[PDB]
């Protein structure tokens, strides 16, 4: 007696699918998911009786936002919806459209059933999307086969590049040449359903409608190239790749170099032999049409900031695996904090170098600060394993080097003695001006590098000679060496009272399981976010008398500027908003140790 709305080719009723989804999208409780998964005894009513997707839709509607994330296992946890999971996997676009429409209907019905007043016109105007994810096993890109050609799949891989956003027409806009009447036409399966005659019966001219391109409505499309991860490849051949299409607010979900998951329908389409013909090649382009993407506190901060031993505590915590080099550790901690910037340029960078014998802990020290710092890099003074120090013009494009890439982070450079001369010259304007000047291919700019450098350098030959000065042992020239705030020597000279305890400390790491090593990054982050020290007036006189003292003892104003920056860094430590006399005194003292080399 009535028509039926059926998912084509399946005999699934769309009313049944709709209500099966509705009765989960409302009245599901998160406790059921722990029944499906392992560790079911961790169910807890005071956290798990929540109407999980009512909670999601409420926060979502208070944010007015269109998208819902949906772990597909939650369908299998709920009795009226376990079949909907199979329909979702096997017939995804229809089921997903049904789920989208159901989310919009839930939003509409909530503001009249839960009946709090809201802009019904806003919800009416808005589109809504489900993002199903964790659909199933992350089957290999190399394992896909033509049975997948309409199923919802899951992939993992590496983003190589993405197009700019591509406008994709959703509604064509037509205008009549004779009578200027206008009509909107939805694009159906990518085809413009052109009106052959003008709509208005009082005009009805044939072939008179014309497309007004910049009055059409466009969705956003983007194409991204995903390479097979080397974890999955067989050893003797190239990795594969798959192009994936991604739309609207999922555009620019990822960038070049991102390792990601995607959940998406595997799709295929024919391609033409030549554009002037309908003739199609007998095997289709394949792509995945994605619906979800994913990559790969203050109380304690203030509590720890009250401590008296904080300087030593934090300094030892940067590398507790390494035997005692404690003034180096203190210097590198102060480098992590850094000074302050000013408008007028003078900036907050602090720069450190380690020299002495090659076969010693300095490399591990650079590695540890690299692991700690938010956005630093590790490199060495010459060559390029597809990563190099200086900015460089190549094909035409400008590439930014490791110094420039380390903007706002510590740049760790090993083999700093063996650095090439053009690089040795280039370091001057980042040391002084924190920038590098580019003047080629019609582009002129001072490309701002804004990086603190931790250098690791070596003597000539196998051993450092401490009876000779640093300039006599090291290759790199004094005017560059002068720019470093703190400069250190680490030596392998035999002493059992050091070597035995080093060996016992080292060997004990294989047996054993205060050291806030994981809280260190959070402390550094909140300090850099919140604290901007200013110099006390008494600290002016302290800086002046200390500088004239070391001047009476070959100093330069670069040492005074260094003492300022170190004192400001010392004031970020302890979360102090104004540089104290003790901050100046420790900056002075540590520099007095360093300048004696």
């Amino acid at each position: 007696s009535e028509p039926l709305r059926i998912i084509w080719g399946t005999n699934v009723s769309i009313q049944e699918c709709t209500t099966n989804f509705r009765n989960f999208l409302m009245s599901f409780k998160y406790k059921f998911r722990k029944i499906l998964d392992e560790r079911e005894e961790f169910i807890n009513n005071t956290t798990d009786e929540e109407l999980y997707y009512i909670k999601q839709l409420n926060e979502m509607r208070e944010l007015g936002t269109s998208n819902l994330n949906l772990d597909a296992r939650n369908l299998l946890a709920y009795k009226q919806t376990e079949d909907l999971y199979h329909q979702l996997l096997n017939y995804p676009q229809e089921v997903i459209s049904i789920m989208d429409q159901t989310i919009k209907d839930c939003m509409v019905s909530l503001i009249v059933d839960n009946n709090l007043d809201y802009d019904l016109d806003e919800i009416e105007t808005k589109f809504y999307k489900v993002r199903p994810y964790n659909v199933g096993s992350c089957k290999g890109m190399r394992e896909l086969n033509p049975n997948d050609i309409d199923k919802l799949i899951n992939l993992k891989g590496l983003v190589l590049r993405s197009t700019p956003v591509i406008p994709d027409m959703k509604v064509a806009f037509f205008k009549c040449n004779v009578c200027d009447h206008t009509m909107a036409v939805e694009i159906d399966r990518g085809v413009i359903q052109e009106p052959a005659r003008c709509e208005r019966i009082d005009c009805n001219e044939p072939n008179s409608m014309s497309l007004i391109h910049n009055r059409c409505s466009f969705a956003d499309k983007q194409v991204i190239k995903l390479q097979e991860t080397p974890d999955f490849v067989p050893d003797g051949q190239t990795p594969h790749s798959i192009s994936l299409c991604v739309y609207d607010e999922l555009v620019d979900s990822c960038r070049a170099g991102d390792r990601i998951e995607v959940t998406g329908t595997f799709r295929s389409i024919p391609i033409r032999a030549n554009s002037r013909q309908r003739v199609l090649k007998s095997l289709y382009k394949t792509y995945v049409d994605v619906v979800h993407v994913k990559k790969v506190d203050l109380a304690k901060i203030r509590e720890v900031a009250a401590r008296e031993d904080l300087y030593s505590l934090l300094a030892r915590s940067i590398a507790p695996s390494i035997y005692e080099l404690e003034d180096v550790k203190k210097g590198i901690l102060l480098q992590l904090f850094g000074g302050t910037n000013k408008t007028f340029r003078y900036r907050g960078d602090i720069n450190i170098l380690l020299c002495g014998d090659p076969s010693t802990s300095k490399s591990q020290i650079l590695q540890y600060v690299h692991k700690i710092t938010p956005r630093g890099v590790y490199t060495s003074g010459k060559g390029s394993s597809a990563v190099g120090l200086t900015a460089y013009i190549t094909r035409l494009v400008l590439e930014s080097g490791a110094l420039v890439l380390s903007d706002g982070g510590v740049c760790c450079i090993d083999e700093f003695d063996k650095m090439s001369d053009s690089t040795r010259s280039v370091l001057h304007e980042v040391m002084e001006q924190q920038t590098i000047s580019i003047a080629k291919a019609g582009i002129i700019t001072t490309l701002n590098a804004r990086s603190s450098i931790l250098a690791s350098a070596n003597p000539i030959g196998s051993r450092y000679n401490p009876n000779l000065p640093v300039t006599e042992n090291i290759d790199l020239p004094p005017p560059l060496l002068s720019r470093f705030d703190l400069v250190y020597l680490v030596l392998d000279k035999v002493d059992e009272k050091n070597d035995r305890e080093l060996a016992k400390h080292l060997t004990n790491l294989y047996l054993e399981d205060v050291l806030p090593v994981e809280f260190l990054t959070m402390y550094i982050s909140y300090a850099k976010e919140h604290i901007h020290p200013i110099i006390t007036e008494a600290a002016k006189t302290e800086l002046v008398r200390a500088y004239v003292g070391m001047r009476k003892m070959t100093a330069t104003t670069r040492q005074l500027e260094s003492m300022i920056r170190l004192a400001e860094a010392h004031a970020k430590m302890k979360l102090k908003n104004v540089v104290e006399l003790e901050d100046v005194q420790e900056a002075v003292r540590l520099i007095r140790s360093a300048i004696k080399d």
Binding site: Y91, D100, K170, D289
Partner: protein, 76 residues
């Protein structure tokens, strides 16, 4: 300017109407509805919103026809 605001609201009513006649996802997403009639026979349409609204499906199946009756014509 007030009357211009009135005009903009009047056409915004048309916007909230055509939105419901528009796909919530891109045109190539292309899920297929099948209308089974009251008899044992089936029609097919690609309308993504029409999957949940037979009103849209029926009037789209009507608009899909290539045929039009020919129409007739009709100084100092």
């Amino acid at each position: 300017g007030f009357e211009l605001s009135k005009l903009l609201q009047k056409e915004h009513q048309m916007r909230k109407n055509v939105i419901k006649h528009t796909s919530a996802r891109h045109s190539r997403f292309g899920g297929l509805l099948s209308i089974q009639t009251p008899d044992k026979t089936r029609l097919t349409v690609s309308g993504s919103q029409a999957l949940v609204d037979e009103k849209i499906a029926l009037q789209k199946l009507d608009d899909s026809k290539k045929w039009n009756k020919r129409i007739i014509k009709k100084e100092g």
